[PDB]
Amino acid sequence: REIITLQLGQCGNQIGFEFWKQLCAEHGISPEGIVEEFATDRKDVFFYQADDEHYIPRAVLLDLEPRVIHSILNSPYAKLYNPENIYLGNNWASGFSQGEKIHEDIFDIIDREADGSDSLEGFVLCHSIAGGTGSGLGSYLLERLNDRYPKKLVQTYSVFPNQDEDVVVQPYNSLLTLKRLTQNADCVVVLDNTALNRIATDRLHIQNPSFSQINQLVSTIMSASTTTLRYPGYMNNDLIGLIASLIPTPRLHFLMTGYTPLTTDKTTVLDVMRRLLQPKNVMVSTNHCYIAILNIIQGEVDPTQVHKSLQRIRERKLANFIPWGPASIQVALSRKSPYLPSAHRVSGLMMANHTSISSLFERTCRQYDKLRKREAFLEQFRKEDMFKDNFDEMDTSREIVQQLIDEYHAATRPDYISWG
Amino acid sequence: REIITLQLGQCGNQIGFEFWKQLCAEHGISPEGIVEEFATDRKDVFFYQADDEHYIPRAVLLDLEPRVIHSILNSPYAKLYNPENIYLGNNWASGFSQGEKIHEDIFDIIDREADGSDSLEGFVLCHSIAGGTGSGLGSYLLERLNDRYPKKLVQTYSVFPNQDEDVVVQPYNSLLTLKRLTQNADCVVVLDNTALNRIATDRLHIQNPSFSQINQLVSTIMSASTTTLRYPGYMNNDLIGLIASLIPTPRLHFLMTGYTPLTTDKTTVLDVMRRLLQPKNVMVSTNHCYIAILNIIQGEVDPTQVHKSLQRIRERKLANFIPWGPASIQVALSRKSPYLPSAHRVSGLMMANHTSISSLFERTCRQYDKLRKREAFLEQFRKEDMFKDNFDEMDTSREIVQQLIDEYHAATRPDYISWG
Amino acid sequence: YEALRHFLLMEDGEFAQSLSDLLFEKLPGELLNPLVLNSVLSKALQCSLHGDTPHASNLSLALKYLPEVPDVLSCLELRYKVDWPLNIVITEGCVSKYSGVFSFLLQLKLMMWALKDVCFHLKRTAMAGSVQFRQLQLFKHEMQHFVKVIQGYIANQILHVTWCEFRARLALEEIQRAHAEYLHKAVFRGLLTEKAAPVMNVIHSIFSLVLKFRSQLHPNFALMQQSYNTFKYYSHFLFKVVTKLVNRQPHLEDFLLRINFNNY
Amino acid sequence: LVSGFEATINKFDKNFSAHLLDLLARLSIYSGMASVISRLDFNGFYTERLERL
């Protein structure tokens, strides 16, 4: 019923610490984990039922060679949580082998927290790709969660590892990780470092401190995606009911991200609807078409004019679509986030299955094919050779992602009645 | 539905900046582009649908070697517009070659703004001829717009490059530009620097600051020509319905300009009707006859007495005309321009197809023939020789304008049943 | 009243220019069934940015000419719906004439659409000085000139001089009469009445020849030349008929004025 | 697997199309607002396959 949250990798632990500081700010709770008189919300989603009726969040921290985890530890939000779920090489095979050798005690920590909760609903993975040891270890951990719990749901918050150029084995890492994400995950929420960097240089003139502000954007997106569960609404107060609508088939299960405010330093519903449809507002970077779109809206918004707006967007005919299937845009509304003062109160978020992500996948495949034909940028490791002697695992993952590209472009067609 | 406005050349960018300051004064908008509570008008004509429901005008600025564009830029009306459509040699061939070499990125700016708008109705060109690099580049840009969009309409605001004497290749420039205006334009609005200078020395005793006041006259004429579209009337709220009446054939498509107030420091309809007919009131400098006349009237004018006035002008028989065709003077009325205090409230404007412009064309042909027979005033450039080695392009353009003069004088005849 | 004028006398910027252009694409089963004429209005008001009032929505909408196809008749009626506390003044026979003046008005834009069509069909041929292009477009100009000036007469009579009346009246039996006399004079100066009926009658011959001129897009140059040749005879015949009926109308004298300045 | 699964899914598919086309027929008579039908199948495919004229 309760979801166990994991932060994995070094950069993933950074954005997880940002997200838990964000939850300390969002709910009416102290940095010691203490429920206050300024806290009525739901606390059975990410909060471990800690013992003094103080709903302490679940921050399962798994890592090897911790450096930024120490700076996370010397913080007043390490008194918000510590049920001892914190635990103490830039290639995929190295992190894979590191996850393989110490699987048992970290899986004992996982079973420990799973028995600690009243029940289980899913494992959400808070990660940033290309964190060094985080990649590879993340795919192995994803395989362990998928193998051990085939009746639960796994969500993957992931960035697209592209800063437009150092790790040159990064296309290999993302290629193998994407093969594992196709088969060991039920839904993956993908963000783009390129589009987030472009939007950050769009809103202000920051290029040096941009990473910390992108962490704030990621934390707010993560809060907005789970506000409908953490605060009592009527729909998408469960994970699976939210996930089931957007995914037609378990290989096309990657969702783009968008967010209506650009700066954070009345607004009617028609504005935010066609605002969220524009690709300037999508934080993810030929014919390409959405499969299904769903939006959450949380702010000073009248729930009656949304049918007038949706009528206007319908007769506008503003997006094309996958033109053989009964899919629609799906309008959903949740509560404005309480117990903290927020500027720019109206903020909406979209998760949509778009075949445009196959273009970036094909870009990564083209980069992988170029570096593979050259073969001077695998940076040859003993981990990489020992994990696979003939290096056919990247070719098998290439076959998987080629099948994915074919399925994407067949879904782009009006004929996907048979699989292609 | 929306018209994309272009300002081209240095002097054309000057009069475009004047026209956009004029639109900031005319509509109830701030110099930041912000719609106000003192703004109900139509904002789907020249205003880019900028994002905060603030109808920011479309000021597409294309130029090479900017000098006065910097002085345009350091102005509070550069916060009215800047959707990044501003971009950063006195012969025709030089500007032609300069427009040819950088066609792709400026055409990407054109496609950028065209996809930015909801749809397209036309491209109006705000230019002053003999701006140095502006000439030649303007004909190349006119050819690019005509080739790329053959289903839209192109209007050309242009001055007659004659200050009565420095650029001595100016008859060659205007000759080649007029050949391009005959074939790559659907309607051309021609003004005269001679007649505007004479009217300026008529109304006051200015000879040194006359250019800035002629810019004000050009800005007011440009405002009055588009007031019927920008403000909700019934007729000529579209470009093509306004243009279609005056032009009988696409080679006689040059319209003279006139304007009823002389000074700006009740008035009945009969006064302004026979006022606009007099050539003292025409700001454009043997038998010559109008093809068709149309007037807009905007002020404190009763719409009922216009039929009494038109009866008086009919039985006056005051203009001759093209005497074999069913053309008339066409009376149209629009709203008085609101939201700004205006002295001399009644102001009318005429656009009329007159064969008198063939006299000035023949004057330019005579000047070109004199300088061509002498051949010491082409000021021989490598651009001029490299664009055409034998210099037969001016002779081909001379053949085109000679055919134009023949068609003009055949339309002057009562026999133009067959083309001549 | 000043809201009714926007959407049945089409006092709205690029509402006529967007309703008519979509409606005339049909002439079939389209623009007959109640899901297509039901949606063209909701597109037309939104692209004028002047409409979307309760005087422009929740009003009844039907048609009286079905598309079965020349076709000089437009279609898509619009009615302005009134009820009991508006019934004591505003009449329900007056509203049928509000629809009746809107239909005549949209039929006026049908010619401005058809001539635009044939100038559009001709546009891809050229710029060039080829004879088949220039000598054919010279015919189009004349008919467009005719349309703009009969439109210039109508856009004065039904919209300015009759709209002065019952606007200086708003500056129990009496208010109904003031309303009805205003609309009565609007249809009177529009020359749809029986007194000036032969003046509007010849305009239908004008209009049928404009449709024949629209249908063809040049081997068929001679056919369109002949259609224009019939049109010019009918205009030269209109020149006498309108003059003779000023000894029957000082308001009609503006129309003989409109169609010709000097000229025989 | 891929064949007997096809055998079950096709008869479910045919039954669902019958039960759906009947519903959309009995929903076109109900209004008010046309936004109920327009939002319910908002795609423009299977919005009603038994179209009129």
Question: How many C-alpha atoms does C175 have within 13 Å on its Cβ side?
Answer: 10
Q: Name the token pair of A319.
A: 């997006």
Q: Is A241 helix (H, G, I), strand (E, B) or coil?
A: helix
Residue A294 has phi, psi (to 5 degrees) of -140, 140
Confirm or deny that A132 is annotated as ligand binding: yes
Q: How far is CA A182 from CA A100, A322, B33, B122, C166, in A?
A: 20, 21, 48, 49, 73
Residue C24 has phi, psi (to 5 degrees) of -80, -5
Angle between helices B134-148 and B92-101 in degrees, nearest 10: 50
CA quadruple A273, A274, A280, A286: dihedral, nearest 10: 120
Burial of B55 (0-12, 13-18, 19+ CB in 10 A): buried
The verdict on D8 touching A (C-beta cutoff 8 Å) is no
Q: Which of D39, D40, D41, D47 to mutate to test the interface with A (most CBs of A within 10 A)?
A: D39
Q: Name the token pair of C115.
A: 């001539």
C interface toward A at CB cutoff 8 Å?
A: 39, 42-43, 46
Q: Compute the distance between CA of residue B11 and CA of residue B90 in angstroms, rounded to an integer.
A: 13
Q: Compute the distance between CA of residue B219 and CA of residue C40 in angstroms, rounded to an integer.
A: 38
Are B184 and B142 in contact by the 8 Å Cβ rule? The answer is yes
Going A6 to A8 to A12 to A18, the CA torsion angle's sign is positive
Are B223 and B20 in contact by the 8 Å Cβ rule? The answer is no
Identify the residue whose tokens are 């319908």: A314
Are B1 and B121 in contact by the 8 Å Cβ rule? The answer is yes
Q: Name the token pair of A38.
A: 């300024």
The verdict on A312 touching C (C-beta cutoff 8 Å) is yes
User: Which residues in chain B have Cβ-Cβ distances shorter than 8 Å to C253?
Assistant: 311
Q: Compute the distance between CA of residue B150 and CA of residue B147 in angstroms, rounded to an integer.
A: 6
Q: Which helix (H) or strand (E) holds A292?
A: strand A290-298
Q: Compute the distance between CA of residue A402 and CA of residue A408 in angstroms, rounded to an integer.
A: 10
- Contact: B249, C141; criterion CB under 8 Å: yes
Q: Which of C32, C33, C35 to mutate to test the interface with D (most CBs of D within 10 A)?
A: C35
Residue A178 has phi, psi (to 5 degrees) of -75, -35
Please spell the DSSP secondary structure of D1-53, one letter per residue. --SHHHHHHHHHHHHHHHHHHHHHHHHHS----SHHHHHHT-SSSSS-SS---
Q: Name the token pair of B278.
A: 């007099």
Q: Compute the distance between CA of residue A83 and CA of residue B108 in angstroms, rounded to an integer.
A: 57
Q: Compute the distance between CA of residue C203 and CA of residue C149 in angstroms, rounded to an integer.
A: 12
Q: Compute the distance between CA of residue D24 and CA of residue D46 in angstroms, rounded to an integer.
A: 9
Confirm or deny that A131 is annotated as ligand binding: yes
Are B397 and B372 in contact by the 8 Å Cβ rule? The answer is no
Burial of B413 (0-12, 13-18, 19+ CB in 10 A): middle
Q: Name the token pair of B125.
A: 């060109």
The verdict on C33 touching D (C-beta cutoff 8 Å) is yes
- The number of beta carbons lying within 10 Å of the beta carbon of residue A192 is 21
The residues, any chain, with a CB within 8 Å of residue A258's CB and separated by 6 or more, are A276, A281, A282, A283, A284, A349, A350, A352
Among residues C108, C246, C236, C241, the alpha carbon closest in space to that of B311 is found at C246
The verdict on C130 touching D (C-beta cutoff 8 Å) is no
Q: How far apart are the first and last CA of chain B?
A: 37
The residues, any chain, with a CB within 8 Å of residue B60's CB and separated by 6 or more, are B4, B5, B6, B7, B85, B109, B110, B113
Q: Do chains D and B touch (3 or more CB pairs under 8 A)?
A: no
Q: Compute the distance between CA of residue B226 and CA of residue B23 in angstroms, rounded to an integer.
A: 11
Q: Compute the distance between CA of residue A111 and CA of residue A120 in angstroms, rounded to an integer.
A: 11
CA distance C14 to chain D (A): 26
Q: Is A352 helix (H, G, I), strand (E, B) or coil?
A: strand
Q: Compute the distance between CA of residue B138 and CA of residue B146 in angstroms, rounded to an integer.
A: 12
User: Which residues in chain C have Cβ-Cβ distances shorter than 8 Å to A312?
Assistant: 46
The residues, any chain, with a CB within 8 Å of residue B276's CB and separated by 6 or more, are B258, B260, B295, B348, B349, B350
CA distance A287 to chain D (A): 18
Helix intervals (H) in A231-352 = 239-243, 269-277, 305-316
- Contact: A312, C46; criterion CB under 8 Å: yes
Among residues D34, D35, C47, the alpha carbon closest in space to that of A310 is found at D35
- Contact: A327, D43; criterion CB under 8 Å: yes
Question: How many C-alpha atoms does C38 have within 13 Å on its Cβ side?
Answer: 9
Among residues A80, A75, A78, the alpha carbon closest in space to that of A57 is found at A80
3-state secondary structure chain C: CCCHHHHHCCCCCCCHHHHHHHHCCCCCCCCCCCCCHHHHHHHHCCCCCCCCCCCCCCCCEECCCCCCCCCCCCCCEECCCCCHHHHCCCCCCHHHHHHHHHHHHHHHHHHHHHHHHHHHHCHHHCCCCCHHHHHHHHHHHHHHHHHHHHHHHHHHHHHHHHHHCCCCCCCCCHHHHHHHHHHHHHHHHCCCCCCCHHHHHHHHHHHHHHHHHHHCCCCCHHHHHHHHHHHHHHHHHHHHHHHHCCCCCCCCHHHHHHHCCCCC
The neighbours of chain B, by the rule of 3 or more Cβ pairs under 8 Å, are: C
Tell me which residues of chain B, numbers 23 to 42, contact chain C at a CB-CB cutoff of 8 Å. 40, 42
* Resolution value, angstrom units: 8.7
The verdict on C29 touching D (C-beta cutoff 8 Å) is yes
Q: Compute the distance between CA of residue B267 and CA of residue B277 in angstroms, rounded to an integer.
A: 16
Among residues C98, C97, C13, the alpha carbon closest in space to that of C51 is found at C13
The verdict on B331 touching C (C-beta cutoff 8 Å) is yes
Q: Is A344 left (phi over 0), alpha (psi -120 to 50) or beta?
A: left
Q: Which of B239, B307, B418 to mutate to test the interface with C (most CBs of C within 10 A)?
A: B307
Angle at B41 between CA B26 and CA B219, to 5 degrees: 30
Q: Compute the distance between CA of residue A368 and CA of residue A377 in angstroms, rounded to an integer.
A: 10
Find, in chain D, the residue whose alpha carbon is nearest to that of A292: D43
Are B68 and B74 in contact by the 8 Å Cβ rule? The answer is no
Are A326 and A360 in contact by the 8 Å Cβ rule? The answer is no
Find, in chain A, the residue whose alpha carbon is nearest to that of D45: A326
3-state secondary structure B186-223: CEEEEEEHHHHHHHHHHHCCCCCCHHHHHHHHHHHHHH
Q: Compute the distance between CA of residue B12 and CA of residue B8 in angstroms, rounded to an integer.
A: 5
Identify the residue whose tokens are 């949304």: A306
Helix intervals (H) in A160-297 = 170-183, 193-203, 210-230, 239-243, 269-277
Task: Tell me which DSSP letter residue B59 carries.
Answer: -
Task: Tell me which DSSP letter residue B77 carries.
Answer: G
Q: Are strands B290-298 and B122-126 parallel, antiparallel or unpaired?
A: unpaired
Q: Name the token pair of A91.
A: 């290639």
